Nucleic acid binder design. Structure first.
Ligand SMILES: [Mg+2]
Lengths: 232, 49, 100, 50, 98, 83, 222
RNA sequence: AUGUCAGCGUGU
């Protein structure tokens, strides 16, 4: 109808795995598919709120360039694996998890004590490898909520507690989305035969609902475009 | 979106034939020199040319 | 590791004294982020000796260029080893290959 | 041999793939050469030079 | 003013400097008199320096990527899309290409 | 608000006396509190001096005429006040 | 803090002409300049609804490569001038206009038979030039309300099809520059330069494009 | 609150 655009809407959420997923939005009118797909891809890859490990405190280790008697992996490597932990915090923004392990074997992400308001998407993610029988590792993990990539250098801008010795810092990559790829195909809707559907494939860490991610991206884009809608 | 790939540097298909012909000419000149019909300097200049 | 190499990474890594190379064969009795203890084989045992090889890896020591020299183990408990096998990876070395 | 190894995987034999613009999204008008290369960080840091 | 640690140099003034973005370093001086500022603006500015004093040849010439881009733009195929069309002006051509 | 000084150069015609004239005018405005002859679009003193040079409002002849007039008037006023 | 983001401000409009504008927005989230620029550019130059000429019937001319004796301009330039004509139709999907002119040849748009619904914004648009005084030109213009550029080649012997150009945006160009606030020098400033044909003011095009995108996104608004 | 010697290296 020239001055009428058919309203796109969500029609399918194909959860291939706990992380990989495909969302489908249809119908679209002769070019809006590429525009919407590009906007959603550029918004999801940069402005997706998430949670990641921010601060680590080990019982005996006092700085990042030391080693603990018993662990097969270095403390720097331990923080490196901790950076890759995937977690979903529901209800609050700050969580202090506690890990306590003893005995020969790997330390997996299932050893963190249950918190109720915190869920672990990767329960078999390794952290360290205790080798001596009389070796025990106790860790306290401060996990925050945020967006983007905030290196530890920018998080020490203001000194409040002066960062007591023995408290290590790990750069946080708050983004829960790792890969986005959109594809625009032709779809049949009311025999128009000129309409397109958009399939967005998202590979995440499993801590984000793909439908929630799409709705969040659309909300961000609309909130930004309301300024142009007003235009002083 | 210009880019460099190993297929861009198209080697001419006649390169091997030209090289073989030049090698045959050099071999003929060398064999003529072995008979003593030409000297070292002249054969060197001929090979270079 | 270099995805494309020339096959000389092993020789350069082993010959340079940056990695810990087992002197005698046996099984790895004890692994840690700092030290390695190897229980040597009975064939290579010497008379009147307990028969363990102790390797104290150098961790985070400055080099002459103010860089960091670090040695990391690349073996696990119970893994048999032979003479000349790498037990620890030095700086810019991955499993006995030069990794710059 | 390089082409054979590429064909063993699910990759183009010519070694050039079709990329998309990150900012705008339109296809680049020609296939570009992507791959994996060994990169070295030399001991010449800007913080040591400024 | 830029956020970073390296001095950002104009691509066109490299040829005069014989500089490459190669790890080469450069020095910054600040004229701190009115006369010095006027001399820098009227004599030492890059806009003033466009012809080489050695022979009068221009020193600002596109070298590597500008030439390649302009060469790609100004080139004709034989069966490209939209061949043989008639356009009102350059704006319509730009819109059609985009 | 300045990129080139080609018009100012051709107005002065020397490219060296231009520097001295602009410097003198800039010192007059910066230290002597002289009101610029052109609107100041958040511009530095040197650029303002060059800009008002561009349209012939400032030159060596104009500058020395103005300073001679100023000194004559101020000395006359001082003499009248003293007497 | 997580959902606060940053809202564009410093919205200033500068007008080169009545159908030319530049808009500058300094505070924007990093990378969001491209997202808000490219999408708007695509919508503006490919989805804006508007009325434009589609086909024209020339009296005495059968094909676009023929020649009309009385007119100085060839058929190609006549079609170009007709395409450049800007029209505004209210309440009608498609209308037929009649042009008849004889004598001297300063034929502008003011000679179009007025029908009330159509409103030629620029009546000085020269369509053709008649050389011979004892010559006449009669044309049947057809204007339709469409959406975006529709070339005639991809899409009745006497009738000749002209390029549609339904979009009321002659040129749109976005640029992104550095911008800093609260010592964050990574932010993006968006500068949009637009040139409209004349049917609507340039800022109305931006408003309509933003409204279209918001309506499209309304399904997943929250 | 230096200087010098020697060596290595970077950019030309
Ligand atoms: Mg260089």
């Amino acid at each position: 109808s020239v001055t009428e655009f058919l309203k796109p809407r969500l029609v399918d959420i194909e959860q291939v795995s706990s992380t990989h997923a495909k969302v489908t939005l249809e119908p679209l009118e002769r070019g809006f598919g590429h525009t919407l797909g590009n906007a959603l891809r550029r918004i999801l890859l940069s402005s997706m709120p998430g949670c990641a490990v921010t601060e680590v405190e080990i019982d005996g280790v006092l700085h990042e360039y030391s080693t603990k008697e018993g662990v097969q992996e270095d403390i720097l490597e331990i923080l490196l694996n901790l950076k890759g932990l995937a977690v979903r915090v529901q209800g609050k923004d700050e969580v202090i998890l506690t890990l306590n392990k003893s005995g020969i074997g790997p330390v997996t992400a299932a050893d963190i004590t249950h918190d109720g308001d915190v869920e672990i998407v990767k329960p078999q993610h390794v952290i360290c490898h205790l080798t001596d029988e009389n070796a025990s590792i106790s860790m306290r993990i401060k996990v925050q909520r945020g967006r983007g990539y905030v290196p530890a250098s920018t998080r020490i801008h203001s000194e409040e507690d002066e960062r007591p010795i023995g408290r290590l810092l790990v750069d946080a990559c708050y983004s829960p989305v790792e890969r986005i790829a959109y594809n625009v195909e032709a779809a049949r809707v009311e025999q128009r035969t000129d309409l397109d559907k958009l399939v967005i494939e998202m590979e995440t860490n499993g801590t984000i609902d793909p439908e929630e991610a799409i709705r969040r991206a659309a909300t961000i884009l609309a909130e930004q475009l309301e300024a142009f809608v007003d235009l002083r | 979106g210009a880019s460099v790939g190993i297929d861009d540097m198209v080697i001419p298909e006649k390169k091997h034939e030209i090289i073989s012909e030049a090698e045959a000419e050099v071999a003929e000149i060398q064999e003529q020199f072995q008979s003593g019909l030409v000297t070292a300097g002249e054969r060197y200049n001929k090979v270079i040319d | 590791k270099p995805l494309v190499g020339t096959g000389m990474e092993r020789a350069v890594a082993v010959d340079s004294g940056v990695t810990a190379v087992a002197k005698r064969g046996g099984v790895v009795q004890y692994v840690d982020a700092s030290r390695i203890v190897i229980k040597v084989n009975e064939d290579e045992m010497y008379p009147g000796e307990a028969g363990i090889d102790i390797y104290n890896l150098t961790k985070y020591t400055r080099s002459n260029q103010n860089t960091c020299i670090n040695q990391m183990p690349c073996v696990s408990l119970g893994e048999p080893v032979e003479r000349g096998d790498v037990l620890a990876d030095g700086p810019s070395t991955d499993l006995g290959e030069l990794a710059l | 041999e390089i082409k054979e190894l590429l064909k063993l995987g699910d990759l183009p034999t010519s070694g050039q793939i079709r990329l998309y613009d990150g900012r705008t999204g339109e296809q680049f008008e020609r296939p570009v050469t992507v791959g994996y290369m060994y990169m070295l960080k030399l001991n010449h840091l800007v913080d040591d030079k400024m | 003013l830029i956020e970073g640690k390296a001095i950002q140099l104009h691509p066109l003034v490299c040829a005069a400097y014989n500089a490459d973005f190669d790890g080469d370093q450069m020095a910054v001086h600040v004229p701190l008199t009115l006369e010095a500022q006027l001399e820098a603006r009227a004599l030492m500015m890059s806009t003033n320096n466009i012809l080489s004093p050695a022979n009068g040849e221009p020193i600002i010439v596109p070298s590597q990527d500008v030439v390649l881009g302009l060469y790609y733009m100004t080139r004709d195929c034989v069966n490209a899309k939209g061949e043989g069309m008639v356009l009102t002006g350059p704006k319509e051509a730009e819109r059609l290409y985009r | 608000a300045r990129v080139t000084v080609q018009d100012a150069v051709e107005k002065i015609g020397n490219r060296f006396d231009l520097v001295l004239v602009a410097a003198r005018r800039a010192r007059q405005m910066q230290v002597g509190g002289k009101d610029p002859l052109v609107p100041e679009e958040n511009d530095k003193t040197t650029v303002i001096a060059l800009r008002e040079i561009e349209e012939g409002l400032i030159n060596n002849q104009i500058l020395d005429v103005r300073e001679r007039q100023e000194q004559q008037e101020q000395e006359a006023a001082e003499l009248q006040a003293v007497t």
